[PDB]
Design a protein around this ligand. Structure first.
Ligand SMILES: [K+]
Ligand SMILES: [K+]
Ligand SMILES: [K+]
Ligand SMILES: [K+]
Ligand SMILES: [K+]
Ligand SMILES: [Mg+2]
Ligand SMILES: [Mg+2]
Ligand SMILES: [Mg+2]
Ligand SMILES: [Mg+2]
Ligand SMILES: [Mg+2]
Ligand SMILES: [Mg+2]
Ligand SMILES: [Mg+2]
Ligand SMILES: [Mg+2]
Ligand SMILES: [Mg+2]
Ligand SMILES: [Mg+2]
Ligand SMILES: [Mg+2]
Ligand SMILES: [Mg+2]
Ligand SMILES: [Mg+2]
Ligand SMILES: [Mg+2]
Ligand SMILES: [Mg+2]
Ligand SMILES: [Mg+2]
Ligand SMILES: [Mg+2]
Ligand SMILES: [Mg+2]
Ligand SMILES: [Mg+2]
Ligand SMILES: [Mg+2]
Ligand SMILES: [Mg+2]
Ligand SMILES: [Mg+2]
Ligand SMILES: [Mg+2]
Ligand SMILES: [Mg+2]
Ligand SMILES: [Mg+2]
Ligand SMILES: [Mg+2]
Ligand SMILES: [Mg+2]
Ligand SMILES: [Mg+2]
Ligand SMILES: [Mg+2]
Ligand SMILES: [Mg+2]
Ligand SMILES: [Mg+2]
Ligand SMILES: [Mg+2]
Ligand SMILES: [Mg+2]
Ligand SMILES: [Mg+2]
Ligand SMILES: [Mg+2]
Ligand SMILES: [Mg+2]
Ligand SMILES: [Mg+2]
Ligand SMILES: [Mg+2]
Ligand SMILES: [Mg+2]
Ligand SMILES: [Mg+2]
Ligand SMILES: [Mg+2]
Ligand SMILES: [Mg+2]
Ligand SMILES: [Mg+2]
Ligand SMILES: [Mg+2]
Ligand SMILES: [Mg+2]
Ligand SMILES: [Zn+2]
Lengths: 89, 118, 42, 44
RNA sequence: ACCGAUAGUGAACAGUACCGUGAGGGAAAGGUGAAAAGCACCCCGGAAGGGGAGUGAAAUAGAACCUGAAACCGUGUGCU
RNA sequence: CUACCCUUGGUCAGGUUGAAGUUCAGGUAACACUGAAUGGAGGACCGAACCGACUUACGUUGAAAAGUGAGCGGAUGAACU
RNA sequence: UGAGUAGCGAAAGACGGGUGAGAAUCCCGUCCACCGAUUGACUAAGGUUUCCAGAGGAAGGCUCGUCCGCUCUGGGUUAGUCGGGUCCUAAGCUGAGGCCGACAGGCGUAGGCGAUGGAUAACAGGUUGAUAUUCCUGUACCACCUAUAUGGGGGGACGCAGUAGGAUAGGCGAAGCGUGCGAUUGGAUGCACGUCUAAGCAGUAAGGCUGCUGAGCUGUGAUGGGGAGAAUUCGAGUCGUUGAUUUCACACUGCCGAGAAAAGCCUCUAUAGGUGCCCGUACCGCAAACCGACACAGGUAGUCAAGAUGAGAAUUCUAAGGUGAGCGAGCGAACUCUCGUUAAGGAACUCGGCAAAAUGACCCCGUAACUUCGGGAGAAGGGGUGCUCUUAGAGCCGCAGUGAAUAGGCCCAAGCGACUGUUUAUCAAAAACACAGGUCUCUGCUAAACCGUAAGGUGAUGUAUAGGGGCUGACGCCUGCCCGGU
């Protein structure tokens, strides 16, 4: 279940500053809670989690040509480790 | 005298601003009618500077704006007028400015001119 | 207040007889070999 | 001037929403009519 | 011995867009070419757009692309 | 939207007037009665916010399918929200 | 076609510098101007990516555009404590059984849902292009976990007005300290700013109530932070005055119209370690992003509330902060509109003094008929305001002294309506409606009346000093004749 909870890492300027501060940003399944996120990270990466922050992103308006629709809604989790680190390369 | 499309107070403020700008920069670009009024305002200020007494200085301060001018020295517009400009025009009897037409502006067709100290 | 009849092409063009612009007043500039408005500076 | 439409999320959903339509026989008739016409939107 | 894009379904590309608090109302919009061979390259231009050169049977078939009527808008002038 | 209502909230710069009571003083056989102070009532008064819309000017292919400028009515109440 | 015509949607801009193919219109700067009980700041609804960065200029922008709430690409919203849910109930909605009804369905008991109300644990500082009581730093608190050590009662719990106080916030002044600055215009050696720091935790405490409560203060929190400042280190937190619209607190007094519920809560039958979910969080927000077809002079709930002047949140100029309004340049004709002035006269204008003018603040004199004894009344009509000096006088100046702005015109008489109030959203605000008061009439309670087919309801958790209906319309004096007809 844990590898379903964690979808992908998020790579941005703000996420990179977070990684400099030992915070790792993941896109997670939109149904899971932050406790599940913490358990999944601990299990997958064999690290210790200090805290997990979470937020939702609404669908964003997007178009190509005459077709206007929306992107997928997102759930973003920021995981603060107390022990260890995660190698994304 | 011209009205320049402004009320009395607006016109007076704009003429003071233009005269002080001309004193600071020695050459400005504006509209023809504005320059044709600014020439009289600026020449009377220069006359006051050539007089150079305390009363003439205070009368000039009635009209000039309070703009600092920065060899790292610093002086006010009134100081420049009663110093450098007056000394340069000690021997000339009027006609301290000249207007040079340049042609219409793109945005509104206004006749642009350059008015400069001679 | 409103036109009683439509304006014919003939009448419209007759009215527009004087609706035109004029070539500007221009003179040759000696040094640069170009043109400018008379009594204006480059 | 104060106009007639003063939007209100709660009022809109409570008066014109799916559950309000479901709650009455005539509301279900509305939903059936819109499904028959092929509407993309059935309710508020 | 039905229609042929104002016809025929409202809809040849839509119960969409849009309108309405809502029930509900409800469009417009088809066609390059046989084949994309959809204009390498040069020139003016910031671009847009053009002129060449090329492709093509044909480019006033260059995509707002078959045919291209009329209203309407221009340029030239034989008579007045 | 609007009319009325239900439940639950909120708002009203400042001036002015001075009801009932009370107390003290006169006064009585006992009450009535009177003056001063105190007191702070009122769909009270003047007037901002706010709520209106009386007059007038402007606007009348509007800035606006009912508005704007200047005055104007109410403004602790059957108030406004 | 009208026609290069009307319009381009309230207003102050100017110049220098830059960018660029192109600049009145973009960026930077200086000066100027406008708002400032707000054109400032913060919540809510509503909108829903409009937010940020880089790039772009076809179309949108009432001009232009190098710019944008527009286009392209990539980003941005972090919570045990904030608001909501895992708590409570109001109106209302719904409703197991049940009652009623051609059908469909209507009603309703227990119960349930349902904030606009009740309960409930976190503060200060720092930081980004875009989030922050959410991230970070420091210091806390709450619930639960692990280890060492059910009935009763109370309460919650409530209106409106007014008054006297305590405290604090805030304002002002002296400069006590601190930081700067110290002036080429005649003169002086003075000019301008700063003067703080939370929750929590201990001690205490003006008051209030009949021991319980209680604003606030002190210390700690804090060799931390923030600071007018000097070149990463160093830097002041003091005296007086005024004083709330905040809080003690609906505490106290008074009044009639007599002012939720339920749960949480109360009462009677320590330390240590660890855990703490979901939803919202971007941005606009009295608006260019909401409702008005618009980048529309309209509408849109609450909060914060500086100085001078003043009774004031009025007036005028300013502070904090924000803004110069998405067409301009000339000219200075008629005419239109909005403003200012005007000889002599002064309503001769006109349906009508319509409009305008005049009055206007504060202080002191003074004030009629009539009256329901309250009023009328700010009746009317008159005086005084500047500045300096002495302690009410003496002086000084102007045409003028509330020298600006803001601030009742008044009187006499008549109709109607007693009065405050209400009305034809959008041509009528009135003499119309209402009204307190009067009278008539119905109604003995499963009342009459009203809604509904009914059940069920309103009347009313009322009971003839009550409820419904008709007419009249304060108050004073009064309200005559006719019962043949309806
Ligand atoms: K209410
Ligand atoms: K919202
Ligand atoms: K002219
Ligand atoms: K009766
Ligand atoms: K009879
Ligand atoms: Mg969250
Ligand atoms: Mg002129
Ligand atoms: Mg003026
Ligand atoms: Mg055809
Ligand atoms: Mg068809
Ligand atoms: Mg052809
Ligand atoms: Mg063709
Ligand atoms: Mg207020
Ligand atoms: Mg009153
Ligand atoms: Mg009033
Ligand atoms: Mg009305
Ligand atoms: Mg008005
Ligand atoms: Mg009155
Ligand atoms: Mg035309
Ligand atoms: Mg013309
Ligand atoms: Mg014409
Ligand atoms: Mg004209
Ligand atoms: Mg015009
Ligand atoms: Mg404009
Ligand atoms: Mg504002
Ligand atoms: Mg932006
Ligand atoms: Mg344009
Ligand atoms: Mg964009
Ligand atoms: Mg029911
Ligand atoms: Mg922000
Ligand atoms: Mg925000
Ligand atoms: Mg919109
Ligand atoms: Mg607007
Ligand atoms: Mg508005
Ligand atoms: Mg309002
Ligand atoms: Mg004001
Ligand atoms: Mg605009
Ligand atoms: Mg006169
Ligand atoms: Mg006269
Ligand atoms: Mg007279
Ligand atoms: Mg007459
Ligand atoms: Mg006459
Ligand atoms: Mg009048
Ligand atoms: Mg006054
Ligand atoms: Mg009346
Ligand atoms: Mg009235
Ligand atoms: Mg009307
Ligand atoms: Mg009217
Ligand atoms: Mg009557
Ligand atoms: Mg009889
Ligand atoms: Zn030349």
């Amino acid at each position: 279940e844990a590898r379903d909870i964690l979808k992908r890492p998020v790579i941005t300027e703000k996420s990179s500053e977070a990684m400099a501060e030992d915070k790792y940003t993941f896109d997670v399944d939109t149904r899971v809670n932050k406790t599940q996120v913490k358990m999944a990270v601990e299990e997958i990466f064999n690290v210790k989690v200090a805290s997990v922050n979470i937020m939702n992103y609404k669908p964003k308006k997007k178009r190509m040509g005459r077709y206007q629709g929306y992107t997928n809604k997102r759930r973003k989790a920021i995981v603060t480790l107390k022990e260890g680190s995660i190698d994304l390369f | 005298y011209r009205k320049l499309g402004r009320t009395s107070d607006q016109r007076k403020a704009m003429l003071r601003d233009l005269a002080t700008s001309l004193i600071i920069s020695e050459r400005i670009e504006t509209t023809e009618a504005r320059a044709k009024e600014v020439r009289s305002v600026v020449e009377k200020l220069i006359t006051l500077g050539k007089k150079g007494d305390l009363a003439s200085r205070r009368n000039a301060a009635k009209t000039l704006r309070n703009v600092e001018i920065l060899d790292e020295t610093t002086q006010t517009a009134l100081q420049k007028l009663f110093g450098e400009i007056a000394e340069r025009y000690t021997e000339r009897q009027g006609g301290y400015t000249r207007i040079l037409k340049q042609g219409p502006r793109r945005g509104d067709g206004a006749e642009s001119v350059i008015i400069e100290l001679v | 207040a409103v036109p009683k009849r439509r304006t014919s092409k003939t009448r419209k063009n007759k009215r527009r007889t004087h609706f035109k612009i004029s070539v500007p007043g221009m003179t040759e500039c000696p040094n640069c070999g170009e043109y400018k408005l008379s009594h204006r500076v480059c | 001037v104060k106009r007639t439409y003063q939007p209100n999320k709660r009022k809109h959903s409570k008066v014109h929403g799916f559950r309000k339509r479901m709650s009455t026989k005539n509301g279900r008739k509305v939903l059936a009519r819109r499904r028959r016409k092929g509407r993309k939107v059935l309710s508020a």
